[PDB]
Design a protein around this ligand. Structure first.
Ligand SMILES: CC(C)(C)S(=O)(=O)N[C@@H](Cc1ccccc1)C(=O)N[C@@H](Cc1c[nH]c[nH+]1)C(=O)N[C@@H](CC1CCCCC1)C(O)(O)C(F)(F)C(=O)NCCN1CCOCC1
Length: 330
């Protein structure tokens, strides 16, 4: 089997991408953020504290004939940006783009943090990291991909995110029309539960490529590209007037600037991020100071190849016995 679904930016800046997901019988369609940085499939629900719901579409398990409460199971997660959610667990039928999993763990939120309430466009998350990170207690649950994998034509999914435009998530096949050149594959470490790999280096604009190992994760649920302070300083030094702002909490630049591209290495191959992908707009409405899309990872502890980087590539998440990651230009 296979599946294919379109993913859409939630706003004009590509802060995040949402993908429609069918849950239950009859189907309830929710727009979820596909997140290769976590391993929980959770949704706004009829059980969510009503004052914490403000415009989201909710899952009502009582209206699904295939939903079953998973007795005694609960979940609770905290994300890198400080947001969080928690609740109880159902098993139900879940379909993505024509690919169906029966008996998927659907984590129903009883509580969400203010940042979730305040964002009406994201109805929940679909985690695509390794199932060792799943937070359900006392019996850890498998991800959508792990459940689907043996049925798939090939044990893979691909991410093809758009710049200021929709893109595609595919399951079980590689669309050879969706990229240029060849796919370069690179090793993955699963020891931390992530799609962790090592980039071979970087270049700024038309500059010389610097060969250096940069360990990081491929993370569709993070907006920005977080890299070592040395690399980040080298980038923003090429932008007149850019600076690290204490009050904003990262690099800002004049909205009148033209930004250089950023290149990262995948083995002997190279992925080029155009400069406009690195512009996230005014820091506050009406400001002439704009937020940068490349930021330091120093306060985070790991480098993160978030959407700014991934949307420049066609990315293969190969879930074979020994996982690998593939990157192609497009
Ligand atoms: C505005 C922004 C300054 C650019 S922001 O950073 O707030 N944007 C958010 C994404 C966003 C956009 C729009 C609306 C809502 C949220 C962002 O990029 N958040 C990252 C920031 C980050 C990364 N690393 C450190 N900080 C994040 O937490 N991403 C997680 C998923 C997000 C959470 C908020 C809602 C959207 C999905 C994440 O899963 O990718 C993760 F990998 F960082 C993460 O937290 N992984 C959790 C892993 N735990 C390990 C222990 O076992 C349980 C699993």
């Amino acid at each position: 089997s296979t599946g294919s679904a379109t993913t859409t930016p939630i706003d004009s800046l590509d802060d995040a991408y949402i993908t429609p997901v069918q849950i239950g019988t009859p189907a309830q369609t929710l727009n979820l953020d596909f997140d290769t940085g976590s391993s929980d499939l959770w949704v706004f629900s009829s059980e969510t504290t009503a004052s914490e719901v403000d415009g989201q579409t909710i899952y009502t398990p009582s209206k699904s004939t295939t939903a079953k409460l998973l007795s005694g199971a609960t979940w609770s997660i905290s994300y890198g940006d400080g947001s969080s959610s928690s609740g109880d667990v159902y098993t139900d039928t879940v379909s993505v783009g024509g690919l169906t999993v029966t008996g998927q763990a659907v984590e129903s939120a009883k509580k969400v943090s203010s940042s979730f309430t305040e964002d009406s466009t994201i109805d929940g998350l679909l985690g695509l990291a390794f199932s060792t990170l799943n937070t359900v207690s006392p019996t850890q649950q498998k991800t959508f991909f792990d459940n689907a994998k043996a049925s798939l034509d090939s044990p893979v999914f691909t991410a093809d995110l758009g710049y200021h435009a929709p893109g595609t998530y595919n399951f079980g096949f590689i669309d050879t029309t969706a990229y240029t050149g060849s796919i370069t594959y690179t090793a993955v470490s699963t020891k931390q539960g992530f799609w962790e790999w090592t980039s071979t280096g970087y270049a700024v604009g038309s500059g010389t490529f610097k060969s250096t190992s940069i360990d990081g994760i491929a993370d569709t649920g993070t907006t920005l590209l977080y890299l070592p302070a040395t690399v980040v300083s080298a980038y923003w030094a090429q932008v007149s007037g850019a600076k690290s702002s204490s009050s904003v909490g990262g690099y800002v630049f004049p909205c009148s600037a033209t930004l250089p591209s950023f290149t990262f290495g995948v083995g002997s191959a190279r992925i080029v991020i155009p400069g406009d992908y690195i512009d996230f707009g005014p820091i506050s409405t009406g400001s002439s100071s704009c937020f940068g899309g490349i930021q330091s990872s120093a306060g985070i502890g790991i480098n993160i190849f978030g959407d700014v980087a991934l949307k420049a590539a066609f990315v293969v998440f190969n879930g074979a016995t020994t996982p690998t990651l593939g990157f192609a230009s497009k």
